[PDB]
Amino acid sequence: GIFGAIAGFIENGWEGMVDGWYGFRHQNSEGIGQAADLKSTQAAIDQINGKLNRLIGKTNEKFHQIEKEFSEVEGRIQDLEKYVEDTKIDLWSYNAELLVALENQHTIDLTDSEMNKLFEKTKKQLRENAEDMGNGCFKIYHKCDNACIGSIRNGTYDHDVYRDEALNNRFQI
Amino acid sequence: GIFGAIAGFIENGWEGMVDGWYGFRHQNSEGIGQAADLKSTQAAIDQINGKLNRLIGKTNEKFHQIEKEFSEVEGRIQDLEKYVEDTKIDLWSYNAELLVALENQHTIDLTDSEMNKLFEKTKKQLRENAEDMGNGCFKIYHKCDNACIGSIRNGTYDHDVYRDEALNNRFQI
Amino acid sequence: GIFGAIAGFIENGWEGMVDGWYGFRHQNSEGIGQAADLKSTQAAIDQINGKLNRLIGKTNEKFHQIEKEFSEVEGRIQDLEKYVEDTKIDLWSYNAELLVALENQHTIDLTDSEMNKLFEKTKKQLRENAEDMGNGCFKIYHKCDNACIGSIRNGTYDHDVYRDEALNNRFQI
Amino acid sequence: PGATLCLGHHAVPNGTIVKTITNDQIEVTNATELVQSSSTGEICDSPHQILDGENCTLIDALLGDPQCDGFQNKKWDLFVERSKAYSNCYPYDVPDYASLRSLVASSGTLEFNNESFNWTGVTQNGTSSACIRRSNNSFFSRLNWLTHLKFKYPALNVTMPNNEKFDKLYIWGVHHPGTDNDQIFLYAQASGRITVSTKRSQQTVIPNIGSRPRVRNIPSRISIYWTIVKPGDILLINSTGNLIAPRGYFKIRSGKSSIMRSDAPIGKCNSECITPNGSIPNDKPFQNVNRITYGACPRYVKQNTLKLATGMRNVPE
Amino acid sequence: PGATLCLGHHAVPNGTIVKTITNDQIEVTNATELVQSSSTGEICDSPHQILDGENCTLIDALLGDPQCDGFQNKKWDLFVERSKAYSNCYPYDVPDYASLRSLVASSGTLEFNNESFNWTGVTQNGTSSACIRRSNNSFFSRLNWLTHLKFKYPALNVTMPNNEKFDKLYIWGVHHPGTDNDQIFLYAQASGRITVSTKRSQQTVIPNIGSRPRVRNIPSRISIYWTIVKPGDILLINSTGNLIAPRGYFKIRSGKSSIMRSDAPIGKCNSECITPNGSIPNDKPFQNVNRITYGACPRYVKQNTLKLATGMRNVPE
Amino acid sequence: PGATLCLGHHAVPNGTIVKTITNDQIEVTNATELVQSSSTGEICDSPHQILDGENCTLIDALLGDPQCDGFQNKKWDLFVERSKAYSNCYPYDVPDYASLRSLVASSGTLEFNNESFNWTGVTQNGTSSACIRRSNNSFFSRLNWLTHLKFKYPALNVTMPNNEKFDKLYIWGVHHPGTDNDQIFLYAQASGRITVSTKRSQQTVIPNIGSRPRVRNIPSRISIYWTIVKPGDILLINSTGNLIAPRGYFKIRSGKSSIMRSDAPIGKCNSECITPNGSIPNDKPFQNVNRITYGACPRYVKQNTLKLATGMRNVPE
Ligand SMILES: *[C@@H]1O[C@H](CO)[C@@H](O[C@@H]2O[C@H](CO)[C@@H](O[C@@H]3O[C@H](CO[C@H]4O[C@H](CO)[C@@H](O)[C@H](O)[C@@H]4O)[C@@H](O)[C@H](O[C@H]4O[C@H](CO)[C@@H](O)[C@H](O)[C@@H]4O)[C@@H]3O)[C@H](O)[C@H]2NC(C)=O)[C@H](O)[C@H]1NC(C)=O
Ligand SMILES: *[C@@H]1O[C@H](CO)[C@@H](O[C@@H]2O[C@H](CO)[C@@H](O[C@@H]3O[C@H](CO[C@H]4O[C@H](CO)[C@@H](O)[C@H](O)[C@@H]4O)[C@@H](O)[C@H](O[C@H]4O[C@H](CO)[C@@H](O)[C@H](O)[C@@H]4O)[C@@H]3O)[C@H](O)[C@H]2NC(C)=O)[C@H](O)[C@H]1NC(C)=O
Ligand SMILES: *[C@@H]1O[C@H](CO)[C@@H](O[C@@H]2O[C@H](CO)[C@@H](O[C@@H]3O[C@H](CO[C@H]4O[C@H](CO)[C@@H](O)[C@H](O)[C@@H]4O)[C@@H](O)[C@H](O[C@H]4O[C@H](CO)[C@@H](O)[C@H](O)[C@@H]4O)[C@@H]3O)[C@H](O)[C@H]2NC(C)=O)[C@H](O)[C@H]1NC(C)=O
Ligand SMILES: *[C@@H]1O[C@H](CO)[C@@H](O[C@@H]2O[C@H](CO)[C@@H](O)[C@H](O)[C@H]2NC(C)=O)[C@H](O)[C@H]1NC(C)=O
Ligand SMILES: *[C@@H]1O[C@H](CO)[C@@H](O[C@@H]2O[C@H](CO)[C@@H](O)[C@H](O)[C@H]2NC(C)=O)[C@H](O)[C@H]1NC(C)=O
Ligand SMILES: *[C@@H]1O[C@H](CO)[C@@H](O[C@@H]2O[C@H](CO)[C@@H](O)[C@H](O)[C@H]2NC(C)=O)[C@H](O)[C@H]1NC(C)=O
Ligand SMILES: *[C@@H]1O[C@H](CO)[C@@H](O[C@@H]2O[C@H](CO)[C@@H](O)[C@H](O)[C@H]2NC(C)=O)[C@H](O)[C@H]1NC(C)=O
Ligand SMILES: *[C@@H]1O[C@H](CO)[C@@H](O[C@@H]2O[C@H](CO)[C@@H](O)[C@H](O)[C@H]2NC(C)=O)[C@H](O)[C@H]1NC(C)=O
Ligand SMILES: *[C@@H]1O[C@H](CO)[C@@H](O[C@@H]2O[C@H](CO)[C@@H](O)[C@H](O)[C@H]2NC(C)=O)[C@H](O)[C@H]1NC(C)=O
Ligand SMILES: *[C@@H]1O[C@H](CO)[C@@H](O)[C@H](O)[C@H]1NC(C)=O
Ligand SMILES: *[C@@H]1O[C@H](CO)[C@@H](O)[C@H](O)[C@H]1NC(C)=O
Ligand SMILES: *[C@@H]1O[C@H](CO)[C@@H](O)[C@H](O)[C@H]1NC(C)=O
Ligand SMILES: *[C@@H]1O[C@H](CO)[C@@H](O)[C@H](O)[C@H]1NC(C)=O
Ligand SMILES: *[C@@H]1O[C@H](CO)[C@@H](O)[C@H](O)[C@H]1NC(C)=O
Ligand SMILES: *[C@@H]1O[C@H](CO)[C@@H](O)[C@H](O)[C@H]1NC(C)=O
Ligand SMILES: *[C@@H]1O[C@H](CO)[C@@H](O)[C@H](O)[C@H]1NC(C)=O
Ligand SMILES: *[C@@H]1O[C@H](CO)[C@@H](O)[C@H](O)[C@H]1NC(C)=O
Ligand SMILES: *[C@@H]1O[C@H](CO)[C@@H](O)[C@H](O)[C@H]1NC(C)=O
Ligand SMILES: *[C@@H]1O[C@H](CO)[C@@H](O)[C@H](O)[C@H]1NC(C)=O
Ligand SMILES: *[C@@H]1O[C@H](CO)[C@@H](O)[C@H](O)[C@H]1NC(C)=O
Ligand SMILES: *[C@@H]1O[C@H](CO)[C@@H](O)[C@H](O)[C@H]1NC(C)=O
Ligand SMILES: *[C@@H]1O[C@H](CO)[C@@H](O)[C@H](O)[C@H]1NC(C)=O
Ligand SMILES: *[C@@H]1O[C@H](CO)[C@@H](O)[C@H](O)[C@H]1NC(C)=O
Ligand SMILES: *[C@@H]1O[C@H](CO)[C@@H](O)[C@H](O)[C@H]1NC(C)=O
């Protein structure tokens, strides 16, 4: 949320994108298409797997401890045994609550970040050949067939090839 | 601070904005005006109220515990009672300190974020009709009366209406 | 990482920049040069020193406590003394682990932020006289000698001086 | 000419300083306090059931010191013990005092049921000038001082079954006379042990004759013991002298009751959190009033203030 | 005409609600549970060495109650005590019971070594009808009930050196007869104290004659004591009657062993984490099954669910 | 032609690996260690007042073993007990030893004040060959072994008021002779109990005659007890034999004092944090040297290293 893309300027997610977490939809002379972006997808996944690696399968061994249930009333010593355990449980419960709240805030933010980073990268790549429509979409001011769209998605788009055409279309009356 | 708007490229706050947290000042042919932006204001407020809802009015009930003050010297058992309590208090004191430091860092950042998001939204909306002056202000290159400014604040500004006028003013010699 | 500059659109760091943490390299008619940016450098340093001030030289005094090693087998009381200490140590060990992980995530992010902020400031300053090449570099579309580059680094660059020249170079065929 | 449109944010003339991860002093537009640091100084009588001990400790109310007769059979959520409390009956001690005090405090009741013990062969209802009840010599209301009958004290072997569905708490004692004369005058024989038993427990105590420093002019002592008897078990008391006998049992319950030492006045008011300094509001998550608390209370911390930002960085004109 | 290129992200039709710092309910695309809240209900017999107490408490297996003979010299990682367990030998108590139970549990062995004590002048191997072993009157297997020989019980002053390289745990007892007749019948003299000593310790116990409520028709009692003897130290036993003597010593080890109260069945399965409700998986960091655990276990918390987001905010079409 | 202006950041050839929330290994330009893991191996004699016990335990210095005479009336912040320490006086034990050791350690003083006890009718200043002080038979300096005077030991009933404004700590003992002969030789009568009392407390102890395994050729024992007497209260000692009497009282203070077991040498140096391994620097927030600490110390953790990033991600050319 803090970057402003996911649940922000991107109006909604795409239920029909099932082969990645982030990607591109386009419309050009040859149709309307969708493609996943693998690098951004893997960047988010790697970070979340990093959190999982620090939480899952990491337990501590304990053996003989103190008693925690009692059949008889005893007074002072038992009051202390119970208080030590209640103290411990409340501290661990607090740690667990905070851990999940913080980690979840951070996951939502880092995933929003990866969306924003992909958007920014694409904006820069297009140079003077496109304009940002405000909703995560670019209007590209030149003929941009499937190979051209592919070149943008693959980082091989040469903006100089199309710049004269695009400037003429952008700055007409 | 981490987004760079509040205490960053926005030179200072506005003491005379009392009906919102974020907003717009303008100068045009009809004067100089100020208006609060309700959506950004409410977004920040909702997040802070979320933190408050998790901290205020949420106490734990405890009843019979251990003794924590002693009139007589006793040795081993009393040393343990005192150590358990001192241990507990130091852990909770640490939790409280960290909680406030982290939450405050985050509040400053999320409020900075909401300012940046409003700025970015406005920049995109204006398309080729304005330029960013670097200080949170846009120079708008067409006649933009009160209804026009209102249309920008309400998200109903049609950049195409003014684009020919604006491009002519921007790209003159 | 979360802002996308350091280890992102900036391909790598500069081992030959030893008088600051952030800065500028340029090429113009008079050569290729490097200069550190002191304000961004100090902003990052001040934040890290803030963390250090809250962790270094801040210990707690403790005096008489409980025994923590035992020469004889005793049963119930000793089981409780050992459990209290083991409990305490595990809680502090958890606090230490989390503290370092969170603080380090935040340091990497705040330093990335300071790089991004300097880049954004410079982009705005250049107005219509330059274009972002996508890799942290700007192509400046006018003659920009050493004093001119200096004016950009010092915040005294007047974009209006060069705008006619730059627009002519940018929007040619 | 055109127009200018500037984006901005508010500020205030009276900002507040908070701490963050990277700066110990940064001004924000507003903040709220997370540490409760004050009390009005009264313990509110609602919504917890408060029992003001006044001149009586809990143990004195248990045994039945004559200043504590108004406490009979009362219950509490919180028993409040005052620093002015003092004993004015036969001088006694309780081995493990802290544990008896704790278990009765936690049970939260002084509900007492008399039982008909068969004390054939001895004189019951011994009294003393060190325990005055309405100008008359008296004794602890819940204890039965047994002495010789016609210069005979036969061996007691007295039983009391628990055919109830709950546990019974028995309080009893051993009298330690100041001299050999006193031993003979009271019990008509040389001292010997007292054994109190059940199917699951046994306690034997030896009377020890001798002068202790006088307390309210008394050089003898009583030592207090207790025994819990489970359903279908049986109390057995075996004595040849020196027995301060039970008159019955206390009910023992479990629940939320406790005890607190405080000199704060009780007020007609409503507060969920009690400390020895008085009740405190419980809106805040933390407090630095007292580590001793009862009820729904903020957690005790060492800090006297912790300010949570509730607004943005304040950047004044 | 040109083209449009839109950047976006996935969503799912079945998102999950998580908590964050700023919102207690936000939908993400996926999450994982961090609190283990279920068990299958069996204690897995692997990989920890499990000893099912069946009808025997650990202390009954220690002393050698006749239903516990199959336990001799066995070891465990975890001794499991069942709520149905009951004693069927001479009625006894153990001052500090909890501590003896704890130290034997933690040692993790019932390894016992017989020693040749010099009991010249008394009758060994006393038995009772309250402790039947194969229809014959018997007694605790690890204890030696000494009585008069030809109406004489001479003063015992018996020594046993520890010339081993490890510590020895001795278990012994004092017999409290129900009557003066019984005292004379068994020991041929009036009762007197037992003193068990080493170079570093001394324990003296006084037999107390008297009826306790009958348990399996027995009004007498045995009280159990223990002594640890270090290398190069010496056990000395000094008695004139009422001694329930050791037959030897238990080895005392240190390690990872413990004891748990549970009625869960033991299963043929493999799980690292044991609770009284059964073994639980230990993939998750937290659990709300039981505060009592043994092995590599998640940490007990009060929450029954804590969902960790594993995907972005879910923003459906 | 124009110009190019590139924004960038530094890097180093020798980066350091740290842990984060999302990656257990990421290289940054610089880091600092937060866990102190070393000591020089000496306990610094400044700024805390250190008392090296040398051959003496605190309790031996208290009672006044002849090797501990140099300790009289000394104070400490930290008493250091050495593993080589041994006793060389009359063999003794202290029921609750750990508690007496703790309360004296915490008080931080051996300040002793002699008092004139009225021991009319007995011989004072008993000595033994098991406690040699300058080749002469001797005894604990702070204790007074009372024996018969002309084959008489009359009943002692001796009082000592506390008319001071502070509490007094009395240390005293009971002698357990090895035989009935020894009992008669020393006290001229059969053993009987010792009762030490105040207005608020009573302790009675029974001498138990018998051989214990010999320690430095002595089969008898002394058992050590203590009593605290408050202002306006009175110590009363009632004995007919076997009394190891106090010679006066120790002052009891409150403050920052403690005790530590260590074999580390004391050095001429200045360090605020003491562990049994030696003093450690206290710049870092955490340490993994020892859970046992005294003074302004980092907190003990299990980690041997925790690296805090102090620079950005390192992204080398
Ligand atoms: C700086 O930031 C803080 C925190 O965001 C703001 O403080 C909040 O201010 C609001 C508006 O005044 C408060 O809302 C009111 O709360 C009352 C409850 O008061 C007690 O109970 C809570 C917890 O149980 C305590 O935390 C609190 O300290 C009090 O002891 C309600 O009774 C109020 O009700 C009124 O309005 C409602 C509207 O529906 C009506 O129903 C009622 O008739 C009544 O008149 C109201 O809801 C809120 O409690 C404050 N929170 C805290 C934590 O203090 C500051 O306003 C802000 N300052 C500035 C200048 O912006
Ligand atoms: C929502 O988000 C979660 C968390 O990211 C995803 O859950 C993970 O899903 C993957 C893929 O199915 C799981 O990977 C598999 O793990 C198995 C281990 O299972 C147990 O052990 C772990 C810890 O020890 C427990 O946490 C877990 O609950 C199980 O009890 C492996 O056995 C699997 O191996 C299979 O694939 C490998 C490929 O090399 C082969 O070698 C094997 O032959 C075998 O067939 C596999 O590695 C992973 O465990 C899940 N993690 C958690 C924490 O649950 C969800 O997939 C995701 N949902 C959606 C819709 O995206
Ligand atoms: C990698 O990152 C770390 C942390 O930011 C840097 O370490 C700091 O380096 C500075 C500069 O050298 C150090 O500053 C010096 O501190 C001395 C105190 O030393 C001890 O005390 C502290 C705490 O009490 C301990 O943490 C520390 O380990 C030492 O045991 C001062 O005595 C120094 O004073 C000198 O300069 C001043 C200037 O006014 C003069 O007054 C004096 O005459 C004297 O010559 C100085 O202040 C700082 O202590 C370091 N901090 C830590 C935590 O280690 C690394 O420099 C950095 N590395 C790189 C390559 O950038
Ligand atoms: C043992 O000594 C105490 C204290 O000297 C004696 O108690 C005092 O007795 C006198 C005379 O009866 C009283 O007036 C005092 O009030 C008592 N003092 C205290 C402190 O209690 C006690 O009588 C002596 N015991 C015996 C058996 O003679
Ligand atoms: C609440 O009561 C406690 C009573 O102990 C106060 O804490 C004591 O404060 C005095 C100084 O005023 C110190 O000398 C003591 O060390 C404190 N006692 C303990 C046991 O820590 C406390 O100040 C009171 N708080 C309020 C808000 O009234
Ligand atoms: C003391 O009283 C108890 C209880 O009344 C006596 O024990 C009972 O004795 C009868 C007759 O022998 C038995 O049938 C009962 O089973 C016993 N009851 C219990 C509860 O144990 C005991 O015998 C008496 N003691 C003496 C020495 O006479
Ligand atoms: C595991 O066992 C414990 C057994 O105590 C269960 O906790 C008890 O649950 C009952 C209600 O079912 C409560 O009345 C008790 O207060 C609980 N006991 C204690 C001591 O807290 C627990 O529910 C079981 N958990 C599972 C998952 O089976
Ligand atoms: C009880 O037995 C012990 C141990 O056998 C006797 O103590 C030994 O006595 C001999 C002869 O005097 C000494 O040389 C040994 O050093 C003693 N051994 C130990 C281990 O102390 C003791 O004398 C016997 N007691 C009685 C009263 O006869
Ligand atoms: C400081 O002293 C302690 C002394 O106990 C050291 O910890 C022990 O280390 C040994 C191995 O060297 C282990 O076998 C023990 O289990 C440890 N003892 C305890 C009680 O945990 C410790 O290594 C020393 N540290 C330094 C830095 O010298
Ligand atoms: C872009 O990359 C994909 C990778 O699968 C490839 O199939 C495609 O042909 C590429 N297109 C262009 C235009 O480079
Ligand atoms: C913008 O919205 C406000 C809402 O109060 C309305 O009053 C105003 O007339 C609107 N102006 C335009 C130009 O849409
Ligand atoms: C920029 O600032 C530096 C500060 O050292 C100065 O030396 C330099 O001359 C300045 N250049 C210009 C062009 O302003
Ligand atoms: C500032 O002043 C206002 C009005 O007097 C007051 O309500 C508010 O709480 C004050 N804010 C701070 C942060 O002190
Ligand atoms: C409590 O005791 C004092 C003095 O001993 C007396 O004046 C007062 O009346 C007593 N109060 C009650 C309630 O019994
Ligand atoms: C003892 O006193 C009680 C309580 O007043 C009375 O009911 C009872 O009759 C008395 N019994 C004897 C035997 O004196
Ligand atoms: C217990 O009572 C019985 C039966 O009257 C008697 O024989 C015995 O002496 C009593 N025991 C004690 C210790 O008083
Ligand atoms: C959504 O449905 C799929 C397929 O049925 C399932 O595998 C997945 O776990 C579900 N996700 C959530 C978040 O419930
Ligand atoms: C345990 O005791 C019960 C009833 O006392 C008996 O039926 C069962 O056979 C015993 N089981 C074992 C394993 O000894
Ligand atoms: C006592 O019983 C044991 C164990 O069966 C036996 O070996 C021994 O010979 C018996 N000794 C005597 C003296 O009865
Ligand atoms: C201990 O044994 C010795 C030697 O036989 C004897 O004199 C003494 O009475 C015994 N002591 C006890 C307490 O039985
Ligand atoms: C890198 O090398 C320099 C110079 O040798 C040294 O001062 C610095 O501490 C080193 N940094 C790291 C991170 O190892
Ligand atoms: C301590 O004792 C040893 C051996 O018993 C002796 O050599 C040494 O001189 C003694 N040291 C002191 C300081 O008394
Ligand atoms: C006992 O010894 C002390 C200490 O040297 C001495 O002052 C005193 O006179 C002696 N008293 C008697 C009665 O022997
Ligand atoms: C206590 O001293 C008094 C008075 O001399 C005497 O009668 C009594 O026997 C003594 N008591 C003991 C237990 O020694």
Side-chain angles (χ1 to χ4, degrees), chain F residues 64-70 88-89 131-134 138-140:
Chain F
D65 178 295
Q67 70 200 318
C68 312
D69 287 339
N88 204 19
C89 196
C131 192
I132 302 297
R133 185 183 265 90
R134 294 163 282 157
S138 202
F139 197 64
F140 299 106

Side-chain angles (χ1 to χ4, degrees), chain E residues 60-122:
Chain E
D60 278 343
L62 181 77
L63 302 178
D65 178 295
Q67 70 200 318
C68 312
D69 287 339
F71 293 96
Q72 291 190 356
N73 304 310
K74 293 186 75 149
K75 295 168 284 90
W76 60 92
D77 292 329
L78 188 66
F79 191 102
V80 179
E81 278 188 330
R82 306 309 198 165
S83 66
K84 79 195 173 170
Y86 62 96
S87 298
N88 204 19
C89 196
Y90 206 91
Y92 70 92
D93 66 39
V94 189
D96 215 345
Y97 185 97
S99 287
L100 183 56
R101 181 179 172 274
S102 174
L103 74 86
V104 178
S106 183
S107 173
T109 183
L110 284 164
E111 280 167 291
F112 184 80
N113 276 326
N114 285 290
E115 294 185 306
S116 305
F117 286 89
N118 186 350
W119 304 124
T120 35
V122 294

